[PDB]
Amino acid sequence: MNTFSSFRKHALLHSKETAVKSINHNISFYNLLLLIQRIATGLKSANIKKGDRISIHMGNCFELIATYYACLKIGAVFVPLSLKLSAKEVKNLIQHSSSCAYIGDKKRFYETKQEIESCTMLEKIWVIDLKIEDKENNTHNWEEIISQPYDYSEDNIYTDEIASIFYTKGIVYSQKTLIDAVNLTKVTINPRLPKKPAILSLVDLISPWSILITFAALQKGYSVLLLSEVDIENITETLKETQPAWIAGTPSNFHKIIKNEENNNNSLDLSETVCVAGGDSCATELSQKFFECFGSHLQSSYGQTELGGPVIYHHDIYAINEPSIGWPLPGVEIKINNTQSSNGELLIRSPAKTIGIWNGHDIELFPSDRWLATGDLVRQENNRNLIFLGREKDQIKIEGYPVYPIEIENTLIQHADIAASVVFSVPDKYAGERIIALIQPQKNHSLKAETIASYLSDNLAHYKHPSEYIFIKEIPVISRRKLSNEYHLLKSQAEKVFTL
Ligand SMILES: CCc1cc(C(=O)O)c2c(c1)C(=O)C=C2
């Protein structure tokens, strides 16, 4: 069982349950399968064949998930085009990917029309809500692909065959890569037992992590809630109405949800809700601000397209007082380049092996034993939790020993008088580097400098101690490199500078 057959099995055994819903629409598992079958028939009637690449370019809608599944059913290689791409970058990917067809919605197509319609290898262009005067040549209305009943034609799909290309470099997934990537993602979707759960991903469904989440949720029998851009702009209001059991988002997504409660009397109840902050870093500081706002125990996921899917999962960030990213998922193997130290660079190999990189003309094959160098520094505890020591380019050297800003910042944020902090170093003639702490005092809370110093005496080794404190009422926009370059400016704008 491949990804489409897994969906079809659950769809046919739980046919009347809701598979996908929006605020004002819903489709059952069975009716979703019927839509998928119609699209497949339309694709094959348009002479789309196995191995043909199809660029997909649309916002969150039921047709997007059905189109993925229709591509999987007939073996058409789907190529999702991020909504963040300009018209210029969209056309480049259509050309680079050697796509011969394109499926998009009205908003994205009309932003991109000449570019799309000037890619001459595109035999078919299907647009949801295509305007009638634009039905001509190879541009078709989406209705034409579903106008014909399912023809019950068979499909021979094999696990080694290409399934999709996800551009960061076009990362090629086989059917097996997707099976294994969804299997990793399934382990990270753990809604609480309802006293039926709906899954929400705030990342666009065109983006690989949401694709995997959606497959994984449907295969577990959950419904998937799809939100529009305006729905997410009004996320607190949307959440109060839709009440999903599980929410994936960026750290920025959840920071926004926290901010909205400050100014919205009627509190949103996320206490039963399981929330997963997804990224390539650590969510420890977010998790604890997230707990005293909502009483919810934030989780995190760590992965990237080159590793197939999520590879490291923290099912309870707030339970670990040090910054940490969690535990390798099943089959995930790690290596820490920590020669002669306890801390080192995290190297990962994933059980979801991507096939290679599409370079326009050939697939650059990956030796399936290759490790990925993350650029992140870790230490592995006895229980195999990965303590997160930050971004390797951010480490500081003090008397030869490495110092990790993320670690100092996590200690600093524990103080109630500190709203936020950023630690970085500046050059120093005879010490090499000097540690600076940029401290943001909590509003109203009166400042107070040696308190920080004495606090840090009690909690970090001396060599990690900042040599200097810059008190600033707002920290600029975070890149410790840029702030280090602005060190003299920061001091001149500072409300106070304390030098030890
Ligand atoms: C599909 C590969 C993948 C991509 C991304 C991303 O945010 O780009 C993420 C993860 C996996 C993840 O586990 C949390 C964030």
mmCIF file of all heavy atoms in Angstrom, residues 313-329:
data_model
loop_
_atom_site.group_PDB
_atom_site.id
_atom_site.type_symbol
_atom_site.label_atom_id
_atom_site.label_comp_id
_atom_site.label_asym_id
_atom_site.label_seq_id
_atom_site.Cartn_x
_atom_site.Cartn_y
_atom_site.Cartn_z
ATOM 1 N N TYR A 313 10.762 14.792 17.061
ATOM 2 C CA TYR A 313 9.450 15.160 17.566
ATOM 3 C C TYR A 313 9.557 15.396 19.057
ATOM 4 O O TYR A 313 10.043 14.528 19.784
ATOM 5 C CB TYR A 313 8.440 14.046 17.274
ATOM 6 C CG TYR A 313 7.082 14.176 17.930
ATOM 7 C CD1 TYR A 313 6.383 15.382 17.921
ATOM 8 C CD2 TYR A 313 6.481 13.066 18.513
ATOM 9 C CE1 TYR A 313 5.119 15.483 18.509
ATOM 10 C CE2 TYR A 313 5.221 13.146 19.102
ATOM 11 C CZ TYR A 313 4.546 14.357 19.098
ATOM 12 O OH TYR A 313 3.307 14.429 19.691
ATOM 13 N N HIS A 314 9.088 16.551 19.511
ATOM 14 C CA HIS A 314 9.011 16.849 20.932
ATOM 15 C C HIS A 314 7.550 16.877 21.349
ATOM 16 O O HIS A 314 6.857 17.867 21.093
ATOM 17 C CB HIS A 314 9.647 18.195 21.261
ATOM 18 C CG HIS A 314 10.212 18.244 22.637
ATOM 19 N ND1 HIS A 314 9.507 17.792 23.732
ATOM 20 C CD2 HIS A 314 11.398 18.712 23.107
ATOM 21 C CE1 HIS A 314 10.247 17.952 24.819
ATOM 22 N NE2 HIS A 314 11.396 18.514 24.469
ATOM 23 N N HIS A 315 7.099 15.825 22.036
ATOM 24 C CA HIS A 315 5.695 15.699 22.418
ATOM 25 C C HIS A 315 5.341 16.526 23.648
ATOM 26 O O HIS A 315 4.175 16.539 24.039
ATOM 27 C CB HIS A 315 5.352 14.228 22.671
ATOM 28 C CG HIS A 315 6.225 13.583 23.709
ATOM 29 N ND1 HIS A 315 7.518 13.170 23.445
ATOM 30 C CD2 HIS A 315 5.976 13.242 24.996
ATOM 31 C CE1 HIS A 315 8.032 12.625 24.536
ATOM 32 N NE2 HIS A 315 7.120 12.658 25.493
ATOM 33 N N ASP A 316 6.309 17.213 24.267
ATOM 34 C CA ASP A 316 6.015 18.073 25.410
ATOM 35 C C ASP A 316 7.211 18.987 25.678
ATOM 36 O O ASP A 316 7.988 18.732 26.600
ATOM 37 C CB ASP A 316 5.671 17.222 26.642
ATOM 38 C CG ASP A 316 5.137 18.047 27.786
ATOM 39 O OD1 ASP A 316 4.977 19.274 27.620
ATOM 40 O OD2 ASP A 316 4.872 17.483 28.863
ATOM 41 N N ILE A 317 7.373 20.037 24.868
ATOM 42 C CA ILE A 317 8.531 20.924 24.990
ATOM 43 C C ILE A 317 8.663 21.477 26.400
ATOM 44 O O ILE A 317 9.768 21.561 26.953
ATOM 45 C CB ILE A 317 8.438 22.083 23.987
ATOM 46 C CG1 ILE A 317 8.147 21.573 22.574
ATOM 47 C CG2 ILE A 317 9.704 22.937 24.086
ATOM 48 C CD1 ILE A 317 7.550 22.649 21.690
ATOM 49 N N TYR A 318 7.541 21.879 26.993
ATOM 50 C CA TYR A 318 7.564 22.587 28.266
ATOM 51 C C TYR A 318 8.016 21.700 29.423
ATOM 52 O O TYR A 318 8.430 22.216 30.473
ATOM 53 C CB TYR A 318 6.167 23.155 28.539
ATOM 54 C CG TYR A 318 6.112 24.084 29.725
ATOM 55 C CD1 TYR A 318 7.094 25.063 29.922
ATOM 56 C CD2 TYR A 318 5.089 23.977 30.660
ATOM 57 C CE1 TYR A 318 7.039 25.909 31.024
ATOM 58 C CE2 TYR A 318 5.035 24.824 31.767
ATOM 59 C CZ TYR A 318 6.004 25.781 31.938
ATOM 60 O OH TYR A 318 5.949 26.620 33.022
ATOM 61 N N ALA A 319 7.928 20.374 29.271
ATOM 62 C CA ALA A 319 8.382 19.491 30.345
ATOM 63 C C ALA A 319 9.908 19.502 30.504
ATOM 64 O O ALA A 319 10.407 19.055 31.534
ATOM 65 C CB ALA A 319 7.874 18.063 30.096
ATOM 66 N N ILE A 320 10.651 19.984 29.509
ATOM 67 C CA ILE A 320 12.112 20.035 29.547
ATOM 68 C C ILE A 320 12.507 21.494 29.741
ATOM 69 O O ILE A 320 12.221 22.334 28.877
ATOM 70 C CB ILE A 320 12.751 19.460 28.266
ATOM 71 C CG1 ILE A 320 12.234 18.043 27.974
ATOM 72 C CG2 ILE A 320 14.295 19.470 28.369
ATOM 73 C CD1 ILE A 320 12.416 17.090 29.144
ATOM 74 N N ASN A 321 13.156 21.788 30.873
ATOM 75 C CA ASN A 321 13.548 23.159 31.201
ATOM 76 C C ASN A 321 14.650 23.702 30.285
ATOM 77 O O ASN A 321 14.699 24.914 30.051
ATOM 78 C CB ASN A 321 13.980 23.244 32.670
ATOM 79 C CG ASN A 321 12.825 22.951 33.622
ATOM 80 O OD1 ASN A 321 11.843 23.702 33.697
ATOM 81 N ND2 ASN A 321 12.927 21.839 34.337
ATOM 82 N N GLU A 322 15.541 22.849 29.764
ATOM 83 C CA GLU A 322 16.549 23.312 28.813
ATOM 84 C C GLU A 322 15.971 23.326 27.400
ATOM 85 O O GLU A 322 15.039 22.573 27.094
ATOM 86 C CB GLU A 322 17.791 22.418 28.854
ATOM 87 C CG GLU A 322 18.705 22.608 30.072
ATOM 88 C CD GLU A 322 19.589 23.865 29.981
ATOM 89 O OE1 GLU A 322 20.414 23.971 29.031
ATOM 90 O OE2 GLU A 322 19.474 24.748 30.862
ATOM 91 N N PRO A 323 16.510 24.174 26.514
ATOM 92 C CA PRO A 323 16.089 24.129 25.106
ATOM 93 C C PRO A 323 16.380 22.760 24.507
ATOM 94 O O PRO A 323 17.457 22.196 24.692
ATOM 95 C CB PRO A 323 16.926 25.235 24.437
ATOM 96 C CG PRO A 323 17.337 26.151 25.553
ATOM 97 C CD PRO A 323 17.518 25.228 26.753
ATOM 98 N N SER A 324 15.404 22.223 23.790
ATOM 99 C CA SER A 324 15.495 20.865 23.275
ATOM 100 C C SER A 324 14.537 20.743 22.105
ATOM 101 O O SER A 324 13.563 21.494 22.000
ATOM 102 C CB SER A 324 15.160 19.823 24.355
ATOM 103 O OG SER A 324 13.805 19.940 24.782
ATOM 104 N N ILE A 325 14.829 19.795 21.215
ATOM 105 C CA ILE A 325 13.977 19.543 20.055
ATOM 106 C C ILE A 325 13.283 18.192 20.117
ATOM 107 O O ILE A 325 12.439 17.905 19.257
ATOM 108 C CB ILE A 325 14.753 19.695 18.730
ATOM 109 C CG1 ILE A 325 16.051 18.878 18.730
ATOM 110 C CG2 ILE A 325 15.089 21.161 18.480
ATOM 111 C CD1 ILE A 325 16.878 19.055 17.413
ATOM 112 N N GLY A 326 13.590 17.359 21.106
ATOM 113 C CA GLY A 326 12.868 16.118 21.230
ATOM 114 C C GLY A 326 13.630 14.887 20.796
ATOM 115 O O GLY A 326 14.869 14.859 20.827
ATOM 116 N N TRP A 327 12.874 13.859 20.393
ATOM 117 C CA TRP A 327 13.343 12.503 20.137
ATOM 118 C C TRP A 327 13.257 12.160 18.659
ATOM 119 O O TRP A 327 12.229 12.440 18.021
ATOM 120 C CB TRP A 327 12.518 11.476 20.953
ATOM 121 C CG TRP A 327 12.792 11.555 22.438
ATOM 122 C CD1 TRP A 327 13.649 10.775 23.158
ATOM 123 C CD2 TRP A 327 12.217 12.485 23.366
ATOM 124 N NE1 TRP A 327 13.646 11.160 24.485
ATOM 125 C CE2 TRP A 327 12.784 12.219 24.632
ATOM 126 C CE3 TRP A 327 11.280 13.526 23.247
ATOM 127 C CZ2 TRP A 327 12.441 12.949 25.772
ATOM 128 C CZ3 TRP A 327 10.945 14.247 24.378
ATOM 129 C CH2 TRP A 327 11.529 13.954 25.629
ATOM 130 N N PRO A 328 14.291 11.537 18.098
ATOM 131 C CA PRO A 328 14.181 10.957 16.753
ATOM 132 C C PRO A 328 12.987 10.015 16.640
ATOM 133 O O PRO A 328 12.748 9.173 17.504
ATOM 134 C CB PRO A 328 15.500 10.204 16.587
ATOM 135 C CG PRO A 328 16.492 10.970 17.512
ATOM 136 C CD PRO A 328 15.634 11.361 18.694
ATOM 137 N N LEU A 329 12.243 10.166 15.556
ATOM 138 C CA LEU A 329 11.080 9.358 15.248
ATOM 139 C C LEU A 329 11.496 7.938 14.839
ATOM 140 O O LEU A 329 12.676 7.670 14.618
ATOM 141 C CB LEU A 329 10.294 10.055 14.133
ATOM 142 C CG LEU A 329 9.525 11.288 14.594
ATOM 143 C CD1 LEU A 329 9.042 12.110 13.407
ATOM 144 C CD2 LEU A 329 8.338 10.837 15.466
#
